Short mmCIF file of all heavy atoms in Angstrom, two decimals:
data_model
loop_
_atom_site.label_atom_id
_atom_site.label_comp_id
_atom_site.label_asym_id
_atom_site.label_seq_id
_atom_site.Cartn_x
_atom_site.Cartn_y
_atom_site.Cartn_z
N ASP Q 295 29.22 1.41 9.63
CA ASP Q 295 28.16 1.35 10.66
C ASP Q 295 26.76 1.66 10.14
O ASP Q 295 25.79 0.97 10.44
CB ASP Q 295 28.49 2.36 11.77
CG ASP Q 295 27.70 2.11 12.99
OD1 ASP Q 295 27.91 0.99 13.53
OD2 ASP Q 295 26.86 2.96 13.34
N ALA Q 296 26.64 2.74 9.39
CA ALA Q 296 25.31 3.13 8.86
C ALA Q 296 24.85 2.09 7.86
O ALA Q 296 23.72 1.67 7.92
CB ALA Q 296 25.30 4.50 8.27
N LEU Q 297 25.73 1.66 6.95
CA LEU Q 297 25.37 0.63 5.96
C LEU Q 297 24.93 -0.66 6.65
O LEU Q 297 23.93 -1.30 6.25
CB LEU Q 297 26.51 0.40 4.95
CG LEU Q 297 26.84 1.61 4.05
CD1 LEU Q 297 28.26 1.53 3.31
CD2 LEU Q 297 25.72 1.91 3.03
N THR Q 298 25.65 -1.05 7.71
CA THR Q 298 25.27 -2.22 8.51
C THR Q 298 23.83 -2.11 9.05
O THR Q 298 22.99 -3.02 8.90
CB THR Q 298 26.25 -2.43 9.65
OG1 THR Q 298 27.56 -2.63 9.11
CG2 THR Q 298 25.84 -3.62 10.50
N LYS Q 299 23.55 -0.97 9.64
CA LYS Q 299 22.22 -0.63 10.09
C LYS Q 299 21.20 -0.54 8.96
O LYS Q 299 20.07 -0.87 9.15
CB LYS Q 299 22.23 0.72 10.80
CG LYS Q 299 22.75 0.67 12.22
CD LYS Q 299 23.27 1.99 12.62
CE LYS Q 299 23.84 1.97 14.03
NZ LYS Q 299 23.92 3.40 14.56
N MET Q 300 21.57 -0.06 7.80
CA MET Q 300 20.60 0.01 6.71
C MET Q 300 20.27 -1.39 6.26
O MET Q 300 19.11 -1.71 5.98
CB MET Q 300 21.13 0.86 5.56
CG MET Q 300 21.30 2.33 5.97
SD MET Q 300 21.87 3.38 4.66
CE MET Q 300 20.88 2.93 3.29
N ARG Q 301 21.28 -2.26 6.23
CA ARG Q 301 21.03 -3.65 5.83
C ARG Q 301 20.01 -4.33 6.74
O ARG Q 301 19.06 -4.95 6.22
CB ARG Q 301 22.33 -4.49 5.74
CG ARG Q 301 22.03 -5.94 5.48
CD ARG Q 301 23.29 -6.82 5.46
NE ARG Q 301 22.96 -8.23 5.62
CZ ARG Q 301 22.71 -9.11 4.64
NH1 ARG Q 301 22.73 -8.75 3.35
NH2 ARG Q 301 22.44 -10.38 4.97
N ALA Q 302 20.23 -4.23 8.05
CA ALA Q 302 19.31 -4.74 9.06
C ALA Q 302 17.90 -4.25 8.83
O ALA Q 302 16.96 -5.03 8.79
CB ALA Q 302 19.81 -4.33 10.52
N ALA Q 303 17.75 -2.94 8.64
CA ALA Q 303 16.40 -2.33 8.50
C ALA Q 303 15.71 -2.79 7.23
O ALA Q 303 14.53 -3.11 7.24
CB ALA Q 303 16.50 -0.87 8.52
N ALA Q 304 16.47 -2.81 6.14
CA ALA Q 304 16.03 -3.30 4.85
C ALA Q 304 15.42 -4.70 4.95
O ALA Q 304 14.34 -5.01 4.37
CB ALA Q 304 17.29 -3.37 3.91
N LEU Q 305 16.21 -5.57 5.57
CA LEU Q 305 15.84 -6.95 5.76
C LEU Q 305 14.61 -7.12 6.65
O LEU Q 305 13.76 -7.95 6.40
CB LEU Q 305 17.02 -7.72 6.33
CG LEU Q 305 18.10 -8.09 5.33
CD1 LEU Q 305 19.21 -8.74 6.14
CD2 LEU Q 305 17.58 -8.99 4.28
N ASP Q 306 14.50 -6.30 7.66
CA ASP Q 306 13.33 -6.28 8.54
C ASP Q 306 12.09 -5.63 7.88
O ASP Q 306 10.98 -6.12 8.03
CB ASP Q 306 13.69 -5.57 9.81
CG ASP Q 306 12.84 -6.02 11.01
OD1 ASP Q 306 12.47 -7.21 11.16
OD2 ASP Q 306 12.60 -5.15 11.81
N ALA Q 307 12.27 -4.55 7.15
CA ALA Q 307 11.17 -4.01 6.35
C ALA Q 307 10.64 -5.01 5.30
O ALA Q 307 9.44 -4.99 4.92
CB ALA Q 307 11.61 -2.78 5.67
N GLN Q 308 11.55 -5.84 4.79
CA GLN Q 308 11.20 -6.86 3.78
C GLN Q 308 10.16 -7.89 4.28
O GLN Q 308 9.45 -8.50 3.46
CB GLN Q 308 12.45 -7.59 3.30
CG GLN Q 308 12.29 -8.53 2.10
CD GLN Q 308 13.60 -9.21 1.67
OE1 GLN Q 308 14.36 -9.61 2.51
NE2 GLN Q 308 13.81 -9.38 0.36
N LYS Q 309 10.09 -8.10 5.60
CA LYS Q 309 9.06 -9.01 6.25
C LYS Q 309 7.65 -8.42 6.38
O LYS Q 309 6.68 -9.15 6.56
CB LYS Q 309 9.46 -9.42 7.69
CG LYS Q 309 9.10 -8.40 8.84
CD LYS Q 309 8.56 -9.06 10.20
CE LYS Q 309 7.33 -8.29 10.86
NZ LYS Q 309 7.61 -7.54 12.18
N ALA Q 310 7.57 -7.09 6.33
CA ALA Q 310 6.32 -6.38 6.55
C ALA Q 310 5.38 -6.47 5.37
O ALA Q 310 5.79 -6.70 4.25
CB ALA Q 310 6.61 -4.93 6.89
N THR Q 311 4.07 -6.30 5.65
CA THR Q 311 3.10 -6.11 4.58
C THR Q 311 2.71 -4.64 4.63
O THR Q 311 2.29 -4.15 5.70
CB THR Q 311 1.82 -7.00 4.69
OG1 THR Q 311 2.19 -8.38 4.64
CG2 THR Q 311 0.85 -6.71 3.51
N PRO Q 312 2.81 -3.95 3.49
CA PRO Q 312 2.72 -2.51 3.50
C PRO Q 312 1.25 -2.15 3.31
O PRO Q 312 0.57 -2.88 2.60
CB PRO Q 312 3.50 -2.10 2.24
CG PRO Q 312 3.26 -3.18 1.28
CD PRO Q 312 2.92 -4.45 2.10
N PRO Q 313 0.80 -1.04 3.91
CA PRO Q 313 -0.59 -0.56 3.68
C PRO Q 313 -1.17 -0.86 2.26
O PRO Q 313 -2.01 -1.72 2.11
CB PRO Q 313 -0.47 0.91 3.98
CG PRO Q 313 0.43 0.91 5.24
CD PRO Q 313 1.52 -0.15 4.85
N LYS Q 314 -0.65 -0.22 1.23
CA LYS Q 314 -1.16 -0.45 -0.13
C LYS Q 314 -1.44 -1.93 -0.46
O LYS Q 314 -2.23 -2.22 -1.36
CB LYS Q 314 -0.20 0.17 -1.16
CG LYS Q 314 -0.76 0.24 -2.60
CD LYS Q 314 -0.61 1.61 -3.32
CE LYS Q 314 0.60 1.67 -4.24
NZ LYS Q 314 0.58 2.68 -5.34
N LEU Q 315 -0.80 -2.89 0.23
CA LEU Q 315 -0.93 -4.29 -0.14
C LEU Q 315 -1.60 -5.15 0.96
O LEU Q 315 -1.53 -6.39 0.94
CB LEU Q 315 0.45 -4.88 -0.53
CG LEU Q 315 1.24 -4.32 -1.72
CD1 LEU Q 315 2.54 -5.14 -1.94
CD2 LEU Q 315 0.42 -4.26 -3.02
N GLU Q 316 -2.26 -4.52 1.91
CA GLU Q 316 -3.04 -5.30 2.88
C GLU Q 316 -4.06 -6.29 2.29
O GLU Q 316 -4.44 -7.24 2.98
CB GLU Q 316 -3.77 -4.38 3.86
CG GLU Q 316 -2.96 -4.07 5.10
CD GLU Q 316 -3.31 -2.74 5.68
OE1 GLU Q 316 -4.35 -2.18 5.27
OE2 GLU Q 316 -2.53 -2.26 6.54
N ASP Q 317 -4.48 -6.09 1.03
CA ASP Q 317 -5.51 -6.97 0.42
C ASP Q 317 -4.94 -8.15 -0.40
O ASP Q 317 -5.68 -8.87 -1.09
CB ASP Q 317 -6.56 -6.15 -0.39
CG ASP Q 317 -5.96 -5.28 -1.52
OD1 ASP Q 317 -4.76 -4.91 -1.44
OD2 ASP Q 317 -6.74 -4.93 -2.47
N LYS Q 318 -3.64 -8.39 -0.27
CA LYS Q 318 -2.95 -9.39 -1.07
C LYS Q 318 -2.36 -10.49 -0.17
O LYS Q 318 -1.96 -10.24 0.97
CB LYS Q 318 -1.85 -8.73 -1.89
CG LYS Q 318 -2.32 -7.48 -2.64
CD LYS Q 318 -3.10 -7.81 -3.90
CE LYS Q 318 -3.13 -6.57 -4.83
NZ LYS Q 318 -4.44 -6.42 -5.54
N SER Q 319 -2.31 -11.72 -0.69
CA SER Q 319 -1.77 -12.81 0.09
C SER Q 319 -0.24 -12.68 0.08
O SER Q 319 0.33 -11.99 -0.78
CB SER Q 319 -2.23 -14.15 -0.47
OG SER Q 319 -2.06 -14.22 -1.87
N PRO Q 320 0.44 -13.32 1.05
CA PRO Q 320 1.89 -13.17 0.98
C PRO Q 320 2.56 -13.75 -0.26
O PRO Q 320 3.70 -13.39 -0.51
CB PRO Q 320 2.37 -13.85 2.27
CG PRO Q 320 1.20 -13.75 3.19
CD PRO Q 320 0.04 -14.06 2.25
N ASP Q 321 1.87 -14.59 -1.04
CA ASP Q 321 2.43 -15.12 -2.29
C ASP Q 321 1.79 -14.54 -3.53
O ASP Q 321 1.93 -15.08 -4.63
CB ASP Q 321 2.38 -16.65 -2.32
CG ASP Q 321 3.00 -17.26 -1.10
OD1 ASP Q 321 2.25 -17.40 -0.11
OD2 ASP Q 321 4.23 -17.56 -1.12
N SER Q 322 1.14 -13.40 -3.38
CA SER Q 322 0.69 -12.69 -4.54
C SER Q 322 1.93 -12.22 -5.31
O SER Q 322 3.04 -12.10 -4.73
CB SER Q 322 -0.15 -11.49 -4.14
OG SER Q 322 0.55 -10.67 -3.23
N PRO Q 323 1.76 -11.98 -6.62
CA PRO Q 323 2.84 -11.38 -7.40
C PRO Q 323 3.31 -10.01 -6.90
O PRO Q 323 4.48 -9.67 -7.10
CB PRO Q 323 2.25 -11.24 -8.79
CG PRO Q 323 0.76 -11.48 -8.63
CD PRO Q 323 0.59 -12.33 -7.44
N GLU Q 324 2.43 -9.24 -6.27
CA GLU Q 324 2.78 -7.93 -5.79
C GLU Q 324 3.60 -7.98 -4.50
O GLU Q 324 4.46 -7.13 -4.28
CB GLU Q 324 1.52 -7.12 -5.50
CG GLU Q 324 0.58 -6.96 -6.69
CD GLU Q 324 -0.52 -8.01 -6.80
OE1 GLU Q 324 -0.47 -9.08 -6.14
OE2 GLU Q 324 -1.43 -7.75 -7.60
N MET Q 325 3.25 -8.91 -3.61
CA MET Q 325 4.02 -9.08 -2.40
C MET Q 325 5.41 -9.62 -2.76
O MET Q 325 6.40 -9.22 -2.16
CB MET Q 325 3.31 -9.98 -1.38
CG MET Q 325 2.29 -9.21 -0.50
SD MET Q 325 2.95 -7.87 0.52
CE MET Q 325 3.82 -8.76 1.80
N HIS Q 326 5.46 -10.53 -3.72
CA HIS Q 326 6.72 -11.02 -4.32
C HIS Q 326 7.57 -9.83 -4.83
O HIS Q 326 8.70 -9.65 -4.43
CB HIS Q 326 6.33 -11.96 -5.48
CG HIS Q 326 7.45 -12.78 -6.01
ND1 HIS Q 326 7.36 -14.15 -6.13
CD2 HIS Q 326 8.68 -12.44 -6.44
CE1 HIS Q 326 8.49 -14.61 -6.62
NE2 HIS Q 326 9.32 -13.60 -6.79
N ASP Q 327 7.00 -9.02 -5.72
CA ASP Q 327 7.68 -7.87 -6.25
C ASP Q 327 8.05 -6.88 -5.19
O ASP Q 327 9.11 -6.27 -5.25
CB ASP Q 327 6.82 -7.15 -7.32
CG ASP Q 327 7.62 -6.09 -8.12
OD1 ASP Q 327 8.65 -6.47 -8.75
OD2 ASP Q 327 7.23 -4.91 -8.13
N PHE Q 328 7.16 -6.67 -4.22
CA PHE Q 328 7.46 -5.80 -3.10
C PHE Q 328 8.71 -6.29 -2.36
O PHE Q 328 9.59 -5.52 -2.06
CB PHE Q 328 6.28 -5.71 -2.13
CG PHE Q 328 6.60 -4.98 -0.82
CD1 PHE Q 328 6.73 -3.61 -0.80
CD2 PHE Q 328 6.73 -5.67 0.36
CE1 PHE Q 328 6.99 -2.96 0.36
CE2 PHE Q 328 7.00 -5.03 1.51
CZ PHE Q 328 7.14 -3.68 1.53
N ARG Q 329 8.79 -7.58 -2.08
CA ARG Q 329 9.97 -8.08 -1.35
C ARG Q 329 11.22 -7.97 -2.22
O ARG Q 329 12.27 -7.65 -1.72
CB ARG Q 329 9.75 -9.53 -0.88
CG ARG Q 329 8.78 -9.67 0.29
CD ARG Q 329 8.83 -11.09 0.78
NE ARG Q 329 8.28 -12.06 -0.19
CZ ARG Q 329 6.98 -12.31 -0.36
NH1 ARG Q 329 6.10 -11.70 0.39
NH2 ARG Q 329 6.56 -13.20 -1.27
#
C-alpha cells in the first residue's frame, strides 16, 4: 500500500517544475535530469 502510494506521488512530483528550476524550459537539460 505505501509503495503504491509512493509510486503515485513520485510520478506526480515528476510533472512539477521545482523552485530552483523556475528559470528553465521544460526541455532544458536540467529539467530532463530532474525528471
Side-chain angles (χ1 to χ4, degrees):
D295 196 62
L297 295 164
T298 300
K299 282 156 181 199
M300 295 182 45
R301 174 183 162 91
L305 282 176
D306 206 36
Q308 189 179 41
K309 84 140 222 250
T311 299
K314 192 132 97 157
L315 298 184
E316 269 152 13
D317 58 335
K318 312 282 198 217
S319 48
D321 308 86
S322 55
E324 303 93 345
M325 276 299 287
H326 193 128
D327 192 58
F328 172 74
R329 287 189 292 279

